[PDB]
Curated annotation (Swiss-Prot), chain A:
Protein name listed in UniProt: General transcription and DNA repair factor IIH helicase/translocase subunit XPB/SSL2
Comment field (misc): Present with 825 molecules/cell in log phase SD medium.
Subunit structure: Component of the 7-subunit TFIIH core complex composed of XPB/SSL2, XPD/RAD3, SSL1, TFB1, TFB2, TFB4 and TFB5, which is active in NER. The core complex associates with the 3-subunit CTD-kinase module TFIIK composed of CCL1, KIN28 and TFB3 to form the 10-subunit holoenzyme (holo-TFIIH) active in transcription. An additionnal subunit, TFB6, plays a role in the dissociation of the SSL2 helicase from TFIIH after transcription initiation. Interacts directly with TFB6.
Domain Helicase C-terminal: from-to ranges: 167-321
Phenotype of gene-disrupted mutants: Essential, it cannot be deleted; epistasis studies suggest it is involved in damaged DNA excision repair.
Gene: SSL2
Modified residues (Phosphoserine): S330
Origin: domain of life: Eukaryota
Curated annotation (Swiss-Prot), chain B:
Role according to the record: DNA-dependent RNA polymerase catalyzes the transcription of DNA into RNA using the four ribonucleoside triphosphates as substrates. Largest and catalytic component of RNA polymerase II which synthesizes mRNA precursors and many functional non-coding RNAs. Forms the polymerase active center together with the second largest subunit. Pol II is the central component of the basal RNA polymerase II transcription machinery. During a transcription cycle, Pol II, general transcription factors and the Mediator complex assemble as the preinitiation complex (PIC) at the promoter.
Part of the intact protein present: 1175 to 1286 of 1733
Descriptive protein name: DNA-directed RNA polymerase II subunit RPB1
Subunit (UniProt): Component of the RNA polymerase II (Pol II) complex consisting of 12 subunits. Interacts with DEF1; the interaction is direct and serves to bridge RPB1 to the Elongin complex in a DNA-damaged dependent manner. Interacts with the Elongin subunit ELA1. Interacts with the Elongin subunit ELC1. Interacts with ASK10. Interacts with ESS1. Interacts with RTT103. Interacts with SHE2.
This protein's domain notes: The C-terminal domain (CTD) serves as a platform for assembly of factors that regulate transcription initiation, elongation, termination and mRNA processing.
Cross-link (Glycyl lysine isopeptide (Lys-Gly) (interchain with G-Cter in ubiquitin)): K66
Homology family: Belongs to the RNA polymerase beta' chain family.
Subcellular location: Nucleus
Swiss-Prot record, chain C:
Name of the molecule in the record: Transcription initiation factor IIE subunit beta
Entry's localization field: Nucleus
Domain of life the protein comes from: Eukaryota
Native source organism of the sequence: Saccharomyces cerevisiae (strain ATCC 204508 / S288c) (Baker's yeast)
Summary of subunit composition and partner proteins: TFIIE is a tetramer of two alpha (TFA1) and two beta (TFA2) subunits.
Note: Present with 1150 molecules/cell in log phase SD medium.
Swiss-Prot record, chain D:
Location within or outside the cell: Nucleus
Superkingdom in the source lineage: Eukaryota
Encoding gene (name): TFG1
Name of the molecule in the record: Transcription initiation factor IIF subunit alpha
PTM: Phosphorylated on Ser and other residues by TAF1 and casein kinase II-like kinases.
Miscellaneous comment text of the record: Present with 1920 molecules/cell in log phase SD medium.
Quaternary context: TFIIF is composed of three different subunits: TFG1/RAP74, TFG2/RAP30 and TAF14.
Shown residues within the full chain: 401 to 451 of 735
Family to which this protein belongs: Belongs to the TFIIF alpha subunit family.
Function recorded in the entry: TFIIF is a general transcription initiation factor that binds to RNA polymerase II. Its functions include the recruitment of RNA polymerase II to the promoter bound DNA-TBP-TFIIB complex, decreasing the affinity of RNA polymerase II for non-specific DNA, allowing for the subsequent recruitment of TFIIE and TFIIH, and facilitating RNA polymerase II elongation.
The species this protein was found in: Saccharomyces cerevisiae (strain ATCC 204508 / S288c)
Length: 353, 106, 38, 51, 56
């Protein structure tokens, strides 16, 4: 995007990532890297060791801190100090975090300059409209019994894999797929992502996925009609451009964070067809009723409410019964799943061998 | 009695040494034994008789690894011949290379 | 060509020496089509 | 003793391995290759008597 | 010549005074190159290539 929008020649632009670490030899140039590639102190590669000296030796003129909501974290702020720059800028959609370090940005890069409304841009055609919803899926009795006795650490996995969520997701996916909508399913738990993906036979991406494979998956999901839905995880929570994505679903969450909810929603806010008449994006949040998810759900969506988004409670999904088949529809499958999830917790002697 | 051996290979290599040959050059079984034991640091276990014995013999056994090799049994004796030949040629018991003999003169 | 050029006549040819002869999620083995470029 | 073939013998002579296995014939006997006429005829005769 | 002055090894070879030993040095280096190298890396840095008289 950098090259597309400006007239900078590719020769003067250098990329500093894990694949390639070469640095520009020009008098003036641009370096695009990640904080983890510059905040490391103990150990660095020989190729990276020269790059670290290359960054430190020169006196830069401007530093752009993309996603500046993580610069006040433990150590990414070191790049701001180690890297010499006469001006510092911060870019983040959500200027909030659980701790009080958010205020540290004032003396790190300066105060907040400008802010923009969300609903104002929605009505002006700049961004798409979202029909936010929250589905309350009552956990089945058999699983709920283990929920009471089980410890907090294991409790999370129990109500995230309840059979009701599987059936609701299948009906929504089929209904939305029939409508020609691109669906993204977020899940912080890797095990749930794999189980959902393999059960539904859909691609999934998470931490272990390599850069090459995921890039091919993302390109296929954008332009390939056969692949209309994917299964992303916390890795794709933010900073990945999906101009084609329109629908968004989430099954798991990272407790009470109010930024992840907004960051995840951003995947469908840059949809290409955000100006055609009557278009409204969808954001479904599957939460198990009568569980701690409501405490986190009501606490992790407070930021979006302030912006202007309103979540709609959906107690019933019409037409769910008429669907031909649903996962874990019989008690036998539910019992099998219950135990499955529960069980989760001398150089010449060289010829000898 | 004075003293791993469970997996020691049943095959044995026996070397007989001449006292008249070993007293021409001042050597003891201690230095030659450790020289063999240090050539292969701990691969093979060896025992040497004392000088007081009527005949000087060193018994050597190669210990197989934890994994059992069935294909090596056919060449097990062949491997012993291989090490036996090397143990005679490329072993520098003591001295400097390329020095075949030395004579004292006045 | 060099001799003709020395004479000043246009050489309708050139010396031939100047002719410069110039994986995770493996449950979708074959569904993925390679959309590498656009 | 079920001699080998010219192609097999030539391959073994070449540097396919440091030395021929001591029990190469035994290993190939189990596989069924490199049999004898007596064994070759007996199995065929038995294959007919069975029907 | 297959190898020009842009190569550090050649610079040493071209510095030999006597023709006989100098000739031997050049042959040992040039005989192993199987391409004219119309473009050769610049001596200042290996990033950009400096054009050299060649045919490829
Ligand atoms: Mg961004
Ligand atoms: Zn040439």
């Amino acid at each position: 995007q950098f090259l597309q929008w400006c007239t900078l020649q590719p020769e003067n632009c250098a990329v500093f990532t894990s694949d390639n670490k070469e640095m520009f030899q020009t008098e003036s140039g641009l370096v695009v890297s990640t904080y983890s590639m510059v905040a490391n102190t103990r150990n660095r590669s020989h190729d990276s060791q020269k790059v670290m000296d290359f960054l430190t030796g020169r006196e830069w003129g401007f530093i752009i801190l993309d996603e500046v909501h993580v610069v006040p974290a433990a150590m990414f702020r070191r790049v701001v100090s180690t890297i010499a720059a006469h001006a510092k800028l911060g870019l983040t959609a959500t200027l909030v975090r659980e701790d009080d370090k958010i205020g540290d940005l004032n003396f790190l890069i300066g105060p907040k300059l400008y802010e923009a409304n969300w609903m104002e841009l929605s009505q002006k055609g700049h961004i798409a409209n979202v029909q936010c919803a929250e589905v309350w899926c009552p956990m089945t009795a058999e699983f709920y019994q283990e929920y009471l006795r089980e410890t907090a650490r294991k409790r999370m996995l129990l109500y995230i894999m309840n059979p009701t969520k599987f059936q609701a997701c299948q009906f929504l996916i089929q209904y939305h797929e029939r409508r020609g909508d691109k669906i993204i399913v977020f899940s912080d738990n890797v095990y749930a992502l794999q189980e959902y993906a393999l059960k539904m036979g859909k691609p999934f991406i998470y931490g272990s996925t390599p850069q090459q494979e995921r890039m091919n998956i993302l390109q296929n999901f954008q332009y390939n009609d056969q692949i209309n839905t994917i299964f992303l995880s916390k890795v794709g929570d933010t900073s990945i451009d999906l101009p084609e994505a329109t629908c968004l679903i989430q099954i798991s969450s990272h407790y009470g964070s109010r930024r992840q909810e907004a960051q995840r929603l951003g995947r469908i806010l840059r949809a290409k067809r955000r100006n055609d008449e009557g278009f409204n994006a969808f954001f479904y949040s599957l939460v198990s009723k009568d569980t701690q998810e409501m405490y986190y759900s009501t606490k992790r969506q407070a930021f979006l409410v302030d912006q202007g988004y309103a979540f709609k409670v959906i107690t019933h999904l019409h037409g769910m019964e008429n669907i031909p088949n649903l996962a874990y529809a019989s008690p036998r499958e539910r019992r099998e799943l219950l135990q499955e999830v529960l069980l989760k917790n001398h150089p010449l002697i060289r010829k000898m061998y | 009695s004075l003293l791993s051996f469970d997996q020691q290979s049943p095959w044995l290599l026996r070397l007989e040494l001449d006292r008249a040959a070993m007293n021409d050059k001042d050597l003891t079984m201690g230095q030659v034994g450790e020289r063999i034991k240090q050539t292969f640091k701990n691969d093979l276990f060896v025992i040497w008789s004392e000088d007081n014995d009527e005949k000087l013999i060193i018994r050597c056994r190669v210990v197989r690894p934890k994994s059992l090799d069935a294909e090596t049994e056919a060449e097990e004796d062949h491997m012993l011949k291989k090490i036996e030949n090397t143990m005679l040629e490329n072993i520098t018991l003591r001295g400097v290379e390329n020095i075949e003999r030395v004579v004292m003169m006045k | 060509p060099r001799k003709l050029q020395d004479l000043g006549l246009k050489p309708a040819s050139v010396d031939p020496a100047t002719i410069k002869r110039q994986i995770t999620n493996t449950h979708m083995t074959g569904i993925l089509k390679d959309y590498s470029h656009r | 003793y079920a001699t080998l073939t010219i192609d097999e013998a030539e391959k073994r002579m070449d540097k396919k391995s440091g030395e021929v296995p001591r029990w190469l014939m035994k290993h190939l006997d189990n596989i069924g290759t490199t049999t004898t006429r007596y064994d070759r005829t007996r199995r065929k005769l038995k294959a007919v008597a069975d029907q | 010549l297959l190898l020009d002055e842009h190569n550090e090894l050649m610079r040493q070879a071209l510095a030999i005074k006597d023709s006989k030993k100098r000739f031997a040095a050049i042959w040992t280096l040039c005989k192993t190159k199987m391409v004219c190298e119309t473009d050769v890396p610049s001596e200042d840095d290996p990033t950009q290539l400096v054009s050299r008289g060649g045919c490829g």
